[PDB]
Design a protein around this ligand. Structure first.
Ligand code: HEM
Ligand code: HEM
Ligand code: HEM
Ligand code: HEM
Lengths: 141, 146, 141, 146
């Protein structure tokens, strides 16, 4: 869970992301694929080339999910239930990869929110993404 | 570790635009704010009581310049980070006992700071290049643990 | 999260620590100081010598904070709000340390309760200590 | 990295009592049950549907014997883990892409297995000694990563 100020910061940064979330999502996947090539093995049937249609489409999916988590910050475990079975149980994504994507999201956010990516906001965004990551790597029958 | 020739050029070019008096300060302070347990290592620096006190603490700001000095050095010696940082490794592992995972964290927050200041110029390829640098630096610093 | 089976398993196995809680609690601590001497710097005023009374003593406390975490599993974050302010906020214990003591607790239990320490039970215990650790490193207060 | 001659003879003494055809499968089967993402690396090993399937899986027991052996070779020459493991590191990192944090987990799962079997005999000091062996192995395997 997030403090009341963390929730205010995340909503401030993400509100500024706005209509561009899908674009930023694709950018963050790209940054992750280039910075940490190992991450690409989770997408063997994907065309991960620069500007590929599949990456932009996957960026949208990730951004849309993150926007939903934001609007359900106090019940992500329920709002994201289906993504955990998918990433943890079916895809078996090694937990280490969430920190790479999370880091790349922060990095994308920084390069796009000159003014709002303050130290406090940065700490907030980080805890939010770690919280989201935490839910996606859980597995309770 | 090993940056291709274009990644090395790109990292060196972006670096010449870095404000050397601040970047280190911002990155070090952000580490203390974003990862609170790292504050324990800097108790003697004074006010670290709140996020804003950390970001405004001037001993943290000045120590940041030295931290940056070290990254600049590792940078000028990309193919020999182990020896460039050997004495530093000794200090951090043997005397300070900093868990090496924190070396990764700092490299990563320095990357966020770079992205923050340079915006769009901090391209995915330039990021991937700095990620090799920052990983190299954290690995050399952790050497005395191996 | 802690699925029914994890909970059933932890309660099953911890409810076997019995009168040995402080014994095992102290042994795990000893195992931690000896194996990762860096952990000892968090106790600068303790006599951490082999059979120290302070370790036996602190052993008990650790043991009890766990029993209460068991019988509070669906709401551990609450039966421990105070320990988190203590370990994270006040003492600044670097998170990697909780993984070292958690590993030492597993070892003490495996070394004492072979037949309880089965692969599935090992798995649920580890998932528990991990959640306890997550909480002890928490931010919300 | 450096075991005292006392710890060294301590690991060596206990290892000599280890059932070689079994401890390895134990440690591997347990790594898969406890950190399920590891299963992804051995999906070709067949039935991994449940904890019991994993523990009784024959491709998992055989591989486990291979893992115990590499450990035996490290223990046979604690002074040159890097060397002994150079090609092993290559394979795990370049060919298999195993994040190195997992080497630490397998090492610690092995430690738990030793404890489970030698009971009271796996005392804190023996454990301390094994932690260095297991850490050094994890490090020599992560070498091709830096
Ligand atoms: C901020 C964290 C993340 C979010 C919110 C997220 C979100 C999503 C969403 C919305 C989907 C689509 C699910 C569907 O199609 O029904 C998805 C798919 C997927 N995600 Fe993630 N994801 C995250 C972390 C990760 C990580 C770290 C990896 C690996 C580096 C990963 C690998 C995948 C894969 C392989 C797919 C399936 C792609 C396919 O084959 O169609 N995700 N994710
Ligand atoms: C990963 C890149 C890092 C580099 C390049 C680096 C570099 C430096 C430099 C150049 C010094 C100066 C000598 C001195 O003050 O004694 C130093 C000192 C120190 N570093 Fe770092 N460091 C890194 C990460 C870390 C981390 C993550 C921590 C803490 C979690 C840390 C904690 C310290 C402390 C406590 C000293 C302070 C000595 C004093 O009190 O004056 N360093 N570092
Ligand atoms: C399962 C993990 C842990 C549990 C359940 C736990 C539990 C406790 C409890 C119950 C207390 C006594 C509180 C009181 O009576 O005021 C305490 C204090 C403390 N713990 Fe932990 N703890 C855990 C992990 C750690 C770790 C990993 C470290 C450091 C390696 C640590 C460092 C401390 C310290 C330094 C104190 C204060 C001791 C003093 O000066 O009196 N704890 N803990
Ligand atoms: C840290 C100690 C480890 C040791 C001592 C070790 C040792 C070995 C050895 C001896 C081999 C067989 C190579 C050959 O016969 O040519 C091997 C293969 C392999 N290892 Fe490891 N390993 C370790 C950790 C890891 C981890 C943690 C993973 C995954 C999380 C892993 C995954 C693999 C895979 C997938 C192969 C088998 C490939 C196949 O036959 O299909 N290893 N390892």
């Amino acid at each position: 869970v997030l403090s009341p100020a963390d929730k205010t910061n995340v909503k401030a940064a993400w509100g500024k992301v706005g209509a561009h979330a899908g674009e930023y999502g694709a950018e963050a996947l790209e940054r992750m694929f280039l910075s940490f090539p190992t991450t690409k093995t989770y997408f063997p049937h994907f065309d991960l080339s620069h500007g590929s249609a599949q990456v932009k489409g996957h960026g949208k999916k990730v951004a849309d999910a993150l926007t939903n988590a934001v609007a359900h910050v106090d019940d992500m475990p329920n709002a994201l239930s289906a993504l955990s079975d998918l990433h943890a149980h079916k895809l078996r994504v090694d937990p280490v990869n969430f920190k790479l994507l999370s880091h790349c999201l922060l990095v994308t956010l920084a390069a796009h929110l000159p003014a709002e990516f303050t130290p406090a906001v940065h700490a907030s965004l980080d805890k939010f993404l770690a919280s989201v990551s935490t839910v996606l790597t859980s597995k309770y029958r | 570790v090993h940056l291709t020739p274009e990644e090395k050029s790109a990292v060196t070019a972006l670096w010449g635009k870095v404000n050397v008096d601040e970047v280190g300060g911002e990155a070090l302070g952000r580490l203390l704010v974003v990862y609170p347990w790292t504050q324990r290592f800097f108790e003697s620096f004074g006010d670290l009581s709140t996020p804003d006190a950390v970001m405004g603490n001037p001993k943290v700001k000045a120590h940041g310049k030295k931290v940056l000095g070290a990254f600049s050095d590792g940078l000028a010696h990309l193919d020999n980070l182990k020896g460039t940082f050997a004495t530093l490794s000794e200090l951090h592992c043997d005397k300070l006992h900093v868990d090496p995972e924190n070396f990764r964290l700092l490299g990563n927050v320095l990357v966020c700071v770079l992205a923050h200041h340079f915006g769009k110029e901090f391209t995915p390829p330039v990021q991937a290049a700095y990620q090799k640098v920052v990983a190299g630096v954290a690995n050399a610093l952790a050497h005395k643990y191996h």
